[PDB]
Design a binder for these strands. Structure first.
Ligand SMILES: [Mg+2]
Ligand SMILES: [Mg+2]
Ligand SMILES: [Mg+2]
Ligand SMILES: [Mg+2]
Ligand SMILES: [Mg+2]
Ligand SMILES: [Mg+2]
Ligand SMILES: [Mg+2]
Ligand SMILES: [Mg+2]
Ligand SMILES: [Mg+2]
Ligand SMILES: [Mg+2]
Ligand SMILES: [Mg+2]
Ligand SMILES: [Mg+2]
Ligand SMILES: [Mg+2]
Ligand SMILES: [Mg+2]
Ligand SMILES: [Mg+2]
Ligand SMILES: [Mg+2]
Ligand SMILES: [Mg+2]
Ligand SMILES: [Mg+2]
Ligand SMILES: [Mg+2]
Ligand SMILES: [Mg+2]
Ligand SMILES: [Mg+2]
Ligand SMILES: [Mg+2]
Ligand SMILES: [Mg+2]
Ligand SMILES: [Mg+2]
Ligand SMILES: [Mg+2]
Ligand SMILES: [Mg+2]
Ligand SMILES: [Mg+2]
Ligand SMILES: [Mg+2]
Ligand SMILES: [Mg+2]
Ligand SMILES: [Mg+2]
Ligand SMILES: [Mg+2]
Ligand SMILES: [Mg+2]
Ligand SMILES: [Mg+2]
Ligand SMILES: [Mg+2]
Ligand SMILES: [Mg+2]
Ligand SMILES: [Mg+2]
Ligand SMILES: [Mg+2]
Ligand SMILES: [Mg+2]
Ligand SMILES: [Mg+2]
Ligand SMILES: [Mg+2]
Ligand SMILES: [Mg+2]
Ligand SMILES: [Mg+2]
Ligand SMILES: [Mg+2]
Ligand SMILES: [Mg+2]
Ligand SMILES: [Mg+2]
Ligand SMILES: [Mg+2]
Ligand SMILES: [Mg+2]
Ligand SMILES: [Mg+2]
Ligand SMILES: [Mg+2]
Ligand SMILES: [Mg+2]
Ligand SMILES: [Mg+2]
Ligand SMILES: [Mg+2]
Ligand SMILES: [Mg+2]
Ligand SMILES: [Mg+2]
Ligand SMILES: [Mg+2]
Ligand SMILES: [Mg+2]
Ligand SMILES: [Mg+2]
Ligand SMILES: [Mg+2]
Ligand SMILES: [Mg+2]
Ligand SMILES: [Mg+2]
Ligand SMILES: [Mg+2]
Ligand SMILES: [Mg+2]
Ligand SMILES: [Mg+2]
Ligand SMILES: [Mg+2]
Ligand SMILES: [Mg+2]
Ligand SMILES: [Mg+2]
Ligand SMILES: [Mg+2]
Ligand SMILES: [Mg+2]
Ligand SMILES: [Mg+2]
Ligand SMILES: [Mg+2]
Ligand SMILES: [Mg+2]
Ligand SMILES: [Mg+2]
Ligand SMILES: [Mg+2]
Ligand SMILES: [Mg+2]
Ligand SMILES: [Mg+2]
Ligand SMILES: [Mg+2]
Ligand SMILES: [Mg+2]
Ligand SMILES: [Mg+2]
Ligand SMILES: [Mg+2]
Ligand SMILES: [Mg+2]
Ligand SMILES: [Mg+2]
Ligand SMILES: [Mg+2]
Ligand SMILES: [Mg+2]
Ligand SMILES: [Mg+2]
Ligand SMILES: [Mg+2]
Ligand SMILES: [Mg+2]
Ligand SMILES: [Mg+2]
Ligand SMILES: [Mg+2]
Ligand SMILES: [Mg+2]
Ligand SMILES: [Mg+2]
Ligand SMILES: [Mg+2]
Ligand SMILES: [Zn+2]
Lengths: 208, 83, 99, 99
RNA sequence: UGGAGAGUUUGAUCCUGGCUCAGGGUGAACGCUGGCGGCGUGCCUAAGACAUGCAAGUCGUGCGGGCCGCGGGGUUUUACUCCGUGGUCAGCGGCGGACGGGUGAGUAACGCGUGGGUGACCUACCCGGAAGAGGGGGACAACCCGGGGAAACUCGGGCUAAUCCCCCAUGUGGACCCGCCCCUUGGGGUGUGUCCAAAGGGCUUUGCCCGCUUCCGGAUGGGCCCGCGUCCCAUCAGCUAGUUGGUGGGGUAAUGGCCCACCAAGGCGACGACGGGUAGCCGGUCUGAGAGGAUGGCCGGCCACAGGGGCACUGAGACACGGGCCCCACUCCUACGGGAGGCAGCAGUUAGGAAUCUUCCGCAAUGGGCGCAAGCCUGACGGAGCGACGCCGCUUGGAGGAAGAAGCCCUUCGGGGUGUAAACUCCUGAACCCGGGACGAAACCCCCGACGAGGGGACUGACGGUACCGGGGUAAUAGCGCCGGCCAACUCCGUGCCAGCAGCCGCGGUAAUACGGAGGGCGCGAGCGUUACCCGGAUUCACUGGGCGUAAAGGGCGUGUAGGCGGCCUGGGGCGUCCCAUGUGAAAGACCACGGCUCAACCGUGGGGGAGCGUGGGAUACGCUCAGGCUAGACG
RNA sequence: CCGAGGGUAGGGCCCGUGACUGGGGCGAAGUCGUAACAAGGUAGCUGUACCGGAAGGUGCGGCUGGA
C-alpha cells in the first residue's frame, strides 16, 4: 500500500527520472537532475556490476514503482495477464495503465499518480455516472472517467485541468475540460507508451 | 417425492437460488437431478429468473411438489398455464 | 431428558407381539401341512394348506410380510405339498393345489 | 448389455462349473506398452460339454455361486490344448518359487 | 500461450554424483509487529471424557379422556356439566425419528471411482389411469379403583372410543403351485383351482375436499452383482477345509456358502494369493512446462462409525447419532434392591496439544418434517461475534518545499549520507458526527375465478438502523526480514576461534561487508520472518527423460520354464489401433466469454473441453490370430 | 444351534527393555606400530585358508587397476 512517502529516492536508484512527485520532478529541483547517483552512504561510488537477477529486479521495480502498485497486486495483475490472451507484456502494460488512478493521472486530473490515488480514493472521480472510490478499479474500453459535482469546483481539479488546458492526452484516451471527463478509448501499448521499462525483463522476472 | 426447489448458492448476502429437482431427502446443495432454472432473488440483472418450462412441465408430469416458493418461480415463468 | 420416541418404542413392542402371532402361526401351520401331507394324508392335509395360505395372505396385508415374502412362503410351502402329494396322494378333493 | 468375454477354459473338474481364462490386453497407463494381464473366471454350464481345453464365450450372469458369477455362452474353438498348456505350465511354475 | 538456475568434492578443470538453496502451497503453528472492511475459513492430536441449555417433532380436520377458564338447566342450586367447545396436559393412532447434522476410528474391499447387469428386486410419501370402500365384532392404553418400588417406573382388576386390531362377503385386479403357448435364466397375456382387500374425517348435503384398499405404469431413492482403476513391503511364498463346486433346503424384497445337511476334492497364488504396515475413497486441491508426484481440509457424491462389541424388533427403508436389549469401560443417583447416561449435533467445559472460536440472534429467507390450512418444530441453515488463518480491497496522506536545517552515521576533514525526507505553506479529508435507510420477500393465506389456471388484497426482517446514500469532519498505525556468495542491498564501531551466525559453502585467531550495535540500503508491507509437511527445481527412479569399461551399476557362465519380442509376399476377421454420431463423463472447481456486489476476492449465467468407459457403424497400414506360400533367419 | 465377551493352553508377527558383549561412527595435535599411494622401501588388490597386538604376513591361484 503506497509503499509511502519518499519518492525522489526512487527517481534515483534506477537512474531514470520516473516522475513521481510531479511538478517538482518537472521543475529544476528534482534531486535526480541534481544528484543522479542512487541514495545511500555509498551511492556515488563505483557501480556494483548489476547481476542478471539485479537488472530484472531493477527494471521490474521501474515498472512497479511508477504505478505504485503493491507487489502482490502487481503479481496478481501479472498472473491475470499471462492467462489473458495477447502479447503478454503489451497487455500487461495496458492493464497497468487501465487502473483508475493511472487513468486519472493520464487524464491529468492530478500531477502525479499518488495525487490521482487521493483523488479516486477520496471519492472525487466518477466512472459512468456514479463515483468509484477504488484506485484499482479497472476501466473497460469505452467509458467516461469524469469528475463529480462535489469535486468539479475543487481548486485542485481546477488547477490541474488549468494545467491540462491544451495538454496532449493519449490516442487511446480522450479529454473534455468543459465537462472534466474523458473516454478511455482503448488499451495502450508500449509503442503508445513513454515507459522507461523494457517490459520483457519484467516478463522474465516471473519465471524465476 | 421428487421436489422442485430452490437450492441456494452464492455468498453471504449474495443469494442466488437455483430452481432444481432433487429428492425430498437430500440436503439443500445436494446432488440434484436437473437444474431447471435459476433465480436471483435480488433482480441484479434484468434476466434474473430463467426456467426451462418444458423440463419443468416434464418433472411436474412425473410427479413433483414444487415448494412454497418454487410454485411462485414457476408461475412467474409460465409453467402452470394451460393456454 | 426423555423424548417421545418412547411412544414409538412402546408401539414397536406392541407391533412385535402383534405380528409375531401372525408370523409363527405361519410356521406351525406350515409344519402341520407338511407333516400331514408327508404321512400320506389327504384333503385333511390340504385344509391345513389353505389355512396356512389364508394366514400368509392375511399377514401380508399389513406390515408383517412383503407381498414377495408372502409369495415365497407360499411358493415353498405349496410347491412342497404338491411334490409331497406326488407320493401316492391323488387329490381328488383338492383345495389350494390347482389341477 | 451384459459383459461378453472370450476365453479358454483351464479347469472343468467341479460339478456344473468350468474355469475359463480371459486374457485381456490393454496399454499400460504409464509406459503405454500392450500387456496381457490374464484373469480366471469361474463359469456355469450344467450340460457340461466343455472339456478342459475348449475356448468359450462368457456372459455376465446372475450369481450361480460365490465367485461363480458367469455363464458359458457358445463354443468358438475345439481343444486349444496348446493354449491350455501355457497356463498348465504357468501353474507348475509355482512349486519352484517356494522357500 | 510452455520448461531460468546456483553454491559445494580439487592447486585448477571436466565429468558423474549427492547435499543444500532461491518458487509455489497449507485446517497451519510460532516470533516480532498489527488500523479497517468484504469474502471464505478455524481441535489435523485424545474416535479421550463431558457440566449446562437447546439440536425431533407434529396432527383435534383420526379417537377417547383427565385439567382449568366464557354460557347453563335435564330435577324446584353448575353439579350422569351430557354440551356448544377453548385451550392446555398426557394417552391411543398415523406420519416423521432411516432425512438433515457430526466425524475418519475402522475398512486394501465391489468400500470407492467409473461403465454395465438386474428375466434376481424393493421403492413409504408423490404422479398417470383403473376398481372400490358392504356388513359385523374385539381388546388396549388413557381413565377409575388397588398394590409394589427410594426413584426409575412397574403390576393387578374394571372400563371405553377411533383412520387401533380381527372376521365374513363382493375381486377390476394381484399371489401361488401346473390349464400350456409365447418373451426365453424366475412376465403384463393367460385358465380351472386356491388365497387376498378396505377407513373414515371435515364440510354449504340429496356436493366436494382430506384420507383409505388393491393393482399396473412412472419418477426418485436404493439393495445386490460384474468388467476395469485402486498405496508400500517378497527380509510375508504359499494360502484357504464353508474354503471351492453340486444337489436339496432355510432366510432375504432378491442372486449368492448369505446359512445348514449330504456328496465331490476343489478355489486362489510371482499378472503378487496370504500375512504385515498404512489409509476413508472420489469430484477435486496443491504443484508441475507437461507427463507425473503429493494430498483428500472446506464444498459435493458414496461407504463406515455414533463410548468398544454383538444383536434383532418396528418400518417402505435401520440391524438405527439424540429408539431398544445385552456384555464391557467410565460417570452420576441410590434408601444399596437397582436405576440413569452416551456432544464424532450447535455452543461450551476439561484433558492431550505447538493450535483451532461464541454456552450469540433468528426461522426473515431456502430446505426438511407434521398439518387440509393457520401453525409448530428445525443449533439444517440465514446471519452475527471471535482469530491477519488465507484471499481480495483500502488507509496510514497529497501538492509545494534547501545546493540541502537540527539530530544521527561516515568522513580523505573538503564534505558526503539519511534527503523532499522533516518543520512549515496550502487542501483532500480514513476514522468519527448527524439525517435518511434497504435489495435481501412474495409467496403461504384472503377474495373474484370453479373448493383449478389468471386478476386484486393485506401481514411478515434475524442480519440491522447494517451496508449504502446525503451533510459535516481530524493529517490520521508501520513494521518485519535481509545486506559474504547463492540473493537485491555496505560502511563504521564493539567483539577477538570468544560471544555468537548458519539453509549449504563457511565467518569468527585484532583492520569481521558473514557475530553484537549504529548509520545506510534492499525486499515485502499490515504484514514480514521461522518451523514442519508437500510438489517443483530433482533429467536425483529418467514414459516424454538416465545409465552400466574405469565414475554407482553386467548376473561367473551355459541350458532353459513363464514371459517379452518376431523375416517376406497373400486373403478373411477386426482383437489392439484409429475414426464417426451419440450415452455417461453430476453439480462445485479448473478454462473461456459476458455480468452483480464502489473494483477485486467472491458470486451468477452461458459456452467449450473432459481423460476414460459402454454402445452402433466404419477404416485395415501396423500389432493380433487362423489359413496359404516363400527362403534372406534358425536347424539338418 | 449360532453368539459378543471372559477364561485356559499354545502359536505367529512387531515393539520396548535386559547384566554383558560384538562390532560401528565420532571426538581432543593420545599410545602402538607403517599396511597403502612413488619399483611405499616385500608390486598391489581380490578369492580362500591359517596365523598374528594391530594394520597385516604367508600359502595356493587369479588379475594388471604393476614392471
Ligand atoms: Mg510529501
Ligand atoms: Mg513458470
Ligand atoms: Mg447353491
Ligand atoms: Mg567449481
Ligand atoms: Mg576427491
Ligand atoms: Mg567447477
Ligand atoms: Mg549418471
Ligand atoms: Mg516454478
Ligand atoms: Mg502467529
Ligand atoms: Mg467441534
Ligand atoms: Mg475430544
Ligand atoms: Mg467422546
Ligand atoms: Mg430453544
Ligand atoms: Mg400424539
Ligand atoms: Mg380432516
Ligand atoms: Mg460443518
Ligand atoms: Mg478406516
Ligand atoms: Mg493385502
Ligand atoms: Mg490386508
Ligand atoms: Mg474392487
Ligand atoms: Mg455403479
Ligand atoms: Mg404410512
Ligand atoms: Mg390395573
Ligand atoms: Mg372382503
Ligand atoms: Mg369395515
Ligand atoms: Mg437404477
Ligand atoms: Mg424388508
Ligand atoms: Mg431365493
Ligand atoms: Mg463364503
Ligand atoms: Mg489389519
Ligand atoms: Mg488417493
Ligand atoms: Mg518436473
Ligand atoms: Mg488422486
Ligand atoms: Mg463432506
Ligand atoms: Mg461401531
Ligand atoms: Mg458402548
Ligand atoms: Mg454400536
Ligand atoms: Mg419388518
Ligand atoms: Mg435415531
Ligand atoms: Mg442421523
Ligand atoms: Mg438400536
Ligand atoms: Mg432403601
Ligand atoms: Mg447391596
Ligand atoms: Mg427399580
Ligand atoms: Mg449426543
Ligand atoms: Mg419452509
Ligand atoms: Mg447462522
Ligand atoms: Mg479476519
Ligand atoms: Mg504530511
Ligand atoms: Mg541534519
Ligand atoms: Mg470539507
Ligand atoms: Mg476544511
Ligand atoms: Mg416488505
Ligand atoms: Mg407455510
Ligand atoms: Mg392479488
Ligand atoms: Mg398469517
Ligand atoms: Mg459526511
Ligand atoms: Mg548483490
Ligand atoms: Mg569470551
Ligand atoms: Mg543473523
Ligand atoms: Mg583490537
Ligand atoms: Mg572490527
Ligand atoms: Mg552484521
Ligand atoms: Mg524433492
Ligand atoms: Mg520427477
Ligand atoms: Mg524411458
Ligand atoms: Mg568405481
Ligand atoms: Mg564398480
Ligand atoms: Mg559383475
Ligand atoms: Mg553375486
Ligand atoms: Mg561376464
Ligand atoms: Mg538361450
Ligand atoms: Mg515363448
Ligand atoms: Mg482392432
Ligand atoms: Mg457427448
Ligand atoms: Mg462439470
Ligand atoms: Mg460494477
Ligand atoms: Mg461468480
Ligand atoms: Mg457459471
Ligand atoms: Mg485411449
Ligand atoms: Mg583430547
Ligand atoms: Mg606427547
Ligand atoms: Mg603393503
Ligand atoms: Mg608403507
Ligand atoms: Mg610396502
Ligand atoms: Mg616380499
Ligand atoms: Mg603398485
Ligand atoms: Mg589367532
Ligand atoms: Mg592386511
Ligand atoms: Mg607367517
Ligand atoms: Mg592373499
Ligand atoms: Zn524526482
Amino acid at each position: 500500500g503506497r509503499y509511502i512517502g519518499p519518492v525522489c529516492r526512487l527517481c534515483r536508484r534506477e537512474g531514470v527520472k520516473l516522475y513521481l512527485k510531479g511538478e517538482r520532478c518537472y521543475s529544476p529541483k528534482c534531486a535526480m537532475e541534481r544528484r543522479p547517483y542512487p541514495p545511500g552512504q555509498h551511492g556515488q561510488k563505483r557501480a556494483r556490476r548489476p547481476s542478471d537477477y539485479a537488472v530484472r529486479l531493477r527494471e521490474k521495480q521501474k515498472l512497479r514503482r511508477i504505478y505504485g502498485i503493491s507487489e502482490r497486486q502487481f503479481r496478481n495483475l501479472f498472473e491475470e495477464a499471462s492467462k489473458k490472451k495477447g502479447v503478454t507484456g503489451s497487455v500487461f502494460l495496458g492493464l497497468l495503465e487501465s487502473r483508475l488512478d493511472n487513468v486519472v493521472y493520464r487524464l491529468g486530473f492530478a500531477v502525479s499518480r499518488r495525487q490521482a490515488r487521493q483523488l479516486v480514493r477520496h471519492g472525487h472521480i466518477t466512472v459512468n455516472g456514479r463515483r468509484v472510490d477504488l484506485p484499482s478499479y479497472r476501466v473497460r474500453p469505452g467509458d467516461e472517467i469524469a469528475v463529480a459535482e462535489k469535486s468539479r469546483n475543487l481548486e485542485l481539479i481546477r488547477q490541474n485541468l488549468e494545467a491540462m488546458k491544451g495538454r496532449k492526452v493519449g490516442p487511446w484516451l480522450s479529454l473534455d475540460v468543459e465537462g472534466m471527463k474523458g473516454k478511455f478509448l482503448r488499451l495502450p501499448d508500449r509503442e503508445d507508451l513513454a515507459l522507461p521499462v523494457n517490459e520483457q525483463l519484467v516478463i522474465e522476472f516471473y519465471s524465476r | 417425492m421428487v421436489k422442485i426447489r430452490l437450492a441456494r448458492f452464492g455468498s453471504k448476502h449474495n443469494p442466488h437460488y437455483r430452481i432444481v429437482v432433487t429428492d425430498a431427502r437430500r440436503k439443500r446443495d445436494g446432488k440434484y437431478i436437473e437444474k431447471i432454472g435459476y433465480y436471483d432473488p435480488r433482480k441484479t440483472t434484468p434476466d434474473w429468473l430463467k426456467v426451462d418450462v418444458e423440463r419443468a412441465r416434464y418433472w411436474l408430469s412425473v410427479g413433483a411438489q414444487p415448494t412454497d416458493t418454487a410454485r411462485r418461480l414457476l408461475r412467474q415463468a409460465g409453467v402452470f398455464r394451460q393456454e | 431428558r426423555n423424548l417421545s420416541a418412547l411412544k414409538r418404542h412402546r408401539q414397536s413392542l406392541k407391533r412385535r407381539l402383534r405380528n409375531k402371532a401372525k408370523k409363527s402361526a405361519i410356521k406351525t401351520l406350515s409344519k402341520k401341512a407338511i407333516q400331514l401331507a408327508q404321512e400320506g394324508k389327504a384333503e385333511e392335509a390340504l385344509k391345513i394348506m389353505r389355512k396356512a395360505e389364508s394366514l400368509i395372505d392375511k399377514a401380508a396385508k399389513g406390515s408383517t410380510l412383503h407381498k414377495n415374502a408372502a409369495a415365497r412362503r407360499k411358493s415353498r410351502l405349496m410347491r412342497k405339498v404338491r411334490q409331497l402329494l406326488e407320493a401316492a396322494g391323488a387329490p381328488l378333493i383338492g383345495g389350494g393345489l390347482s389341477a | 448389455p451384459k459383459k461378453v468375454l472370450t476365453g479358454v477354459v483351464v479347469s472343468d473338474k467341479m460339478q456344473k462349473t468350468v474355469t475359463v481364462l480371459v486374457e485381456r490386453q490393454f496399454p499400460h497407463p504409464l509406459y503405454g506398452k500392450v500387456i496381457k494381464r490374464s484373469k480366471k473366471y469361474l463359469a456355469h454350464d450344467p450340460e457340461e460339454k466343455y472339456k478342459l481345453g475348449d475356448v468359450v464365450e462368457i456372459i455376465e450372469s446372475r450369481p450361480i455361486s460365490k465367485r461363480k458369477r458367469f455363464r458359458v455362452l457358445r463354443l468358438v474353438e475345439s481343444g486349444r490344448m496348446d493354449l491350455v498348456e501355457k497356463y498348465l505350465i504357468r501353474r507348475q511354475n509355482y512349486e519352484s518359487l517356494s522357500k
